[PDB]
């Protein structure tokens, strides 16, 4: 069982621990987000039991860490006072203060290839191919790369993360081999953060911590693609086989 999910695209955000106007992303995908991505693909209404998703495992290798950028993002500004965001008391604030100013962060030009291994993950892959709601990378405005699922069915996909999945253009030294790539596994634990989603109900979303261990591993330098456009070519060669 298992399939390869490729998270790529111009921008993707995987925030955790932010609860005000400023938003912040983890430099790598968060299990909560990917689980919600599958739940959205399967029609799981907000508030439905998320234990079906329990028992999955997410090893994620970071091809390009990507640049982290902060996207300004106002809400309601430049509108007449009557048509701005409501207050909790119900009376709209004065128009010179009715604007909301959020500073949301997002990863741009970053690409990870998570190898999801679970009990029903093959039905989940078959659900991403025909989604109930549009899958997106973190914020809904970010739209996933068309090669969202590199392979629908793979026996031992981590074995395919160690090798035989192409890689972006990187420095390849003379007489070099085995270019270093950071794999992320789920003592030797990088960080602890609230990921595993106890409930997605918008009224009270709650989570619990998951330790992450990031192990730099060594994959053959043959894997990295040539400088220009070759990455797309090798990747497409990869999807048909």
């Amino acid at each position: 069982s298992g399939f390869l999910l490729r998270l790529a695209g111009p921008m993707q955000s995987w925030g955790e621990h932010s609860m005000f106007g400023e938003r912040d992303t983890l430099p790598y995908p968060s299990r909560s987000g990917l689980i919600g991505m599958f739940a959205a693909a399967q029609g799981v209404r907000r508030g439905d039991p998320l234990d079906r998703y329990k028992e999955l495992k997410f090893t994620v290798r970071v091809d390009r860490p990507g640049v982290r950028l902060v996207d300004f993002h106002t809400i309601g500004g430049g509108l007449p006072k009557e048509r701005t965001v409501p207050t909790a008391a119900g009376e709209r604030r004065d128009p010179k203060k009715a604007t909301i100013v959020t500073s949301r962060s997002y990863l741009a030009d970053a690409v990870f290839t998570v190898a999801v291994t679970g009990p029903e993950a093959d039905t989940i892959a078959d659900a991403l191919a025909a989604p109930y709601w549009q899958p997106y990378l973190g914020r809904r405005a970010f739209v996933p790369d068309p090669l969202l699922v590199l392979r629908r069915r793979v026996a031992d996909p981590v074995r395919e993360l160690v090798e035989a999945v192409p890689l972006p253009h990187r420095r390849v030294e003379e007489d070099a081999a085995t270019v270093l790539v950071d794999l992320i596994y789920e003592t030797r634990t990088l960080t602890v953060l609230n990921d595993v989603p106890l409930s997605f109900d918008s009224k009270s979303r709650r989570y619990s911590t998951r330790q992450i261990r990031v192990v730099p591993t060594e994959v053959p330098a043959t894997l990295v693609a040539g400088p220009g456009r070759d990455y797309q070519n090798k990747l497409f060669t990869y999807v048909k086989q």
Binding site: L69, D71, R83, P86, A129, G228, Q232, F236
Partner: protein, 260 residues
């Protein structure tokens, strides 16, 4: 059933969106920085335009009213990608000075010196419409049908209002391609993961590059997707995008016809 629409609309010297400072918004994508027009800004103009022409489908096509309290449907189903330039773009500073009309025994002590940033380029826009949930939530397939058609026309016709009086950036897209897909929505954004080089323009080259990406994706995954595109150029054929149409509203009509 997912109706998605790609446009390659170019914009002259303008500053449609800007940061907390004056400079416009940029994605760093494909290793080359490129200006962008954020999704919410563009969405706001489209939603305002749809609600103005249409006279609660705006809470259905678009998820919820900003100034209304949540009515248990905050999701809009419609997905708006953030528009970004086909090529890499350097931010172009425009130094300006406001002139003082009353003259002292002094000349040119100008009223106000400053410098504002602008940029121009060919943005590759893209959107999605979750048709089935829109029908299940709206109820009547007809209101949904009119709403979907008018939403596509709004996506095409409009341009954001930002520094528009100083730069008349009003423009029509060069290419639109509406693909009624049943498998899943897909954006042709990776066609431009390698920013195109310059000095000969980008409209035509971006048109055939997006044609190459449509051939390849159509090749790996052959689908029952109904497609069609309309261009302001008759010089180049793009067979992978589907049957060509004489115009944009004729195209929108044929694809709205194709969804139902």
């Amino acid at each position: 059933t997912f109706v998605d629409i790609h446009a390659i609309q170019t914009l002259p010297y303008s500053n449609i969106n800007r940061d907390d400072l004056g400079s416009p918004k940029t994605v760093v994508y494909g290793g080359k920085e490129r200006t962008r027009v954020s999704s919410q800004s563009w969405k706001r103009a489209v939603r305002h335009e749809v609600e103005a022409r249409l006279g609660n489908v705006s809470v259905n096509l678009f998820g919820r009213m900003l100034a209304e309290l949540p009515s248990t449907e905050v999701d809009g189903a419609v997905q708006f990608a953030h528009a970004f330039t086909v090529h890499g773009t350097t931010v172009e500073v425009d130094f300006f000075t406001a002139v003082d009309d009353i003259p002292k025994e002094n000349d040119h002590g100008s009223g106000h010196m400053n410098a504002g940033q602008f940029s121009a380029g060919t943005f590759y826009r893209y959107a999605n419409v979750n048709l089935d949930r829109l029908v299940e939530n709206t109820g009547d397939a007809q209101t949904a049908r009119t709403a979907v058609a008018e939403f596509l026309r709004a996506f095409l016709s409009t341009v954001p209002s930002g520094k528009q009086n100083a730069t008349a950036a009003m423009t029509l897209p060069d290419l639109v391609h509406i693909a009624v897909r049943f498998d899943r929505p897909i954006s042709f954004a990776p066609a431009f993961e390698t920013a195109l080089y310059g000095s000969d323009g980008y409209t035509l080259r971006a048109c055939q590059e997006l044609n190459n990406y449509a051939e390849r994706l159509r090749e790996v995954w052959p689908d029952d997707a109904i497609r069609g595109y309309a261009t302001v150029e008759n010089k180049t054929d793009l067979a992978a995008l589907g049957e060509r149409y004489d115009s944009y509203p004729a195209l929108i009509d044929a694809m709205v016809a194709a969804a139902f």
